[PDB]
């Protein structure tokens, strides 16, 4: 029951925090305002625009009122402001985390493809509704503490509803799981799906160059009837048997000629089969496992051309690839019958093993658009590091604080500083979204520099 003195907020920390707050404020105001002007002048545009609105709203609602409450240590306004400021704050936070998830999913759907403004209204409606409990639980109370008479605006311990009484006690867990863990989980999930989708896209362009793509049944360089991307339909010399097997292969024959999308589906079947056969092979699985995503596709390319058995014959080269001896395996593969028979395909594949990149196949325009989206996902990394100090502070208050442990005043003193730091970090994220997007997108960088 005794105490140490939790007025805390050393007069020295008040200067540092309020200077950091002013820097983040104007830079966040300027940064998000000029971002909105670029969007309103020139799909992903509106999602970034909604994010900047949530950023701008979060800056103006969460920075000044906490700067005042730090220096003045008082709530001068009425009960409406006590119920309005937290309500607007949790609405802007919801808009921000939902815009990021809608933005990440948008990048996944943009790559997997081979009702946007509706989500905005859905985001803002859901963000407001989920923030409503803040406008009901907050209220103004007074007390005679120490030698003064204070007027406090807080989340009331007593509520007129069993649901609100639960929200008053478990608010920080609801914020930590929904406004932090859930976006991190959703984003990391669709980022993983996007990279796996970009990988099966590159292996398509890779094989399309080395094997070609034909929408009608054709005869191969060896002389066998083939369609799609090197999809063997039959090894029989009868052209009539090829048409019969082709119609039996698809299940819905358009007389023997297909489109681009049908061949892509056929191609993905063969890649899945090639991956399964490699994993079932005791010679190929250990080498395939040690390889990166790029060199995995180079091995799948060889399995596409020579089958699992033929690739397994490169005993010396496979061991070199497993031991990451790229140049030694390149020289060894060049001495093969495979290199002599198909030099163009072999030289590109060998180069891919040698350099570990897609440089021999993909064009630079596609290479640039991919690296933008993949790196632009760093907005969630900044989101995770900026909102962690504030969330960690509220978690520690629900974990370490015990009324019966008398040295707790030293703890509340520490939490006051961590709370005002976390409120600056969470606002710096709204301030860093234009800075990070400017430094990353390159296109946005030239649009930013066009101002001044």
């Amino acid at each position: 029951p005794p105490c140490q003195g939790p007025i805390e907020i050393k007069e020295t920390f008040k200067y540092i925090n309020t200077v950091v707050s002013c820097l983040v404020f104007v830079l966040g105001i300027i940064g998000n305002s000029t971002l909105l002007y670029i969007i309103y002048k020139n799909g992903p545009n509106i999602l970034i625009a909604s994010l900047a609105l949530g950023d701008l709203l979060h800056i103006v609602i969460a920075i000044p009122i906490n700067v005042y409450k730090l220096l003045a240590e008082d709530w001068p306004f009425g009960a409406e402001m006590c119920k309005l400021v937290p309500f607007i704050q949790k609405a802007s936070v919801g808009i921000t985390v939902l815009s990021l998830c809608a933005l990440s999913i948008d990048r996944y759907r943009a790559v997997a493809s081979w009702w946007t403004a509706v989500e905005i209204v859905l985001i803002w409606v859901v963000s407001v509704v989920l923030a409503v409990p803040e406008a009901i639980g907050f209220d103004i109370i007074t007390m005679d503490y120490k030698g003064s008479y204070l007027r406090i605006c807080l989340l009331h311990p007593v509520q007129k509803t069993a649901f609100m009484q639960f929200y008053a006690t478990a608010k920080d867990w609801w914020l930590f799981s929904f406004y932090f863990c859930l976006p991190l989980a959703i984003t990391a999930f669709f980022y993983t799906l996007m990279t796996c989708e970009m990988l099966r896209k590159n292996i398509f362009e890779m094989l399309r160059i080395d094997e070609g793509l034909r929408l009608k049944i054709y005869k191969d360089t060896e002389g066998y009837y083939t369609i799609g991307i090197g999809h063997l339909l039959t090894k029989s010399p009868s052209l009539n048997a090829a048409k019969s097997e082709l119609d039996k292969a698809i299940g819905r024959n358009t007389n023997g000629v297909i489109t681009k999308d049908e061949a892509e589906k056929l191609f993905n079947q063969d890649v899945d089969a090639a991956v399964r056969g490699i994993l079932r092979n005791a010679k190929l699985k250990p080498v395939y496992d040690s390889l990166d995503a790029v060199r995995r596709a180079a091995l799948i390319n060889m399995v596409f051309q020579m089958g699992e058995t033929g690739v397994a014959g490169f005993t010396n080269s496979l061991r070199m690839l497993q031991q990451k001896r790229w140049d030694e395996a390149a020289v060894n593969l060049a001495k093969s019958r495979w290199y002599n028979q198909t030099p163009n395909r072999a030289k590109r594949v060998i180069t891919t093993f040698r350099t570990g990149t897609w440089d021999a196949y993909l064009n630079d325009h596609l290479k640039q658009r991919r690296e933008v989206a993949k790196t632009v996902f760093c907005l969630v990394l900044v989101f995770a590091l900026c909102w962690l100090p504030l969330h960690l502070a509220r978690i520690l208050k629900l974990t370490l604080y015990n009324q019966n442990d008398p040295n707790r005043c030293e703890l509340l003193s520490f939490l006051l500083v961590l709370d005002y730091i976390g409120i600056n970090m969470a606002s710096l994220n709204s301030c860093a979204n234009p800075i990070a997007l400017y430094l990353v997108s390159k296109r946005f960088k030239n649009a930013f520099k066009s101002a001044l």
Binding site: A62, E73, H156, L416
Partner: peptide
């Protein structure tokens, strides 16, 4: 912030100085 009860004036003074979150 919030407190277990208004009888904990040390916690209520904490929310007096605490951020509005």
């Amino acid at each position: 912030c919030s407190c277990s009860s208004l009888m904990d004036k040390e916690c209520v003074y904490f929310c007096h100085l605490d951020i509005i979150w």
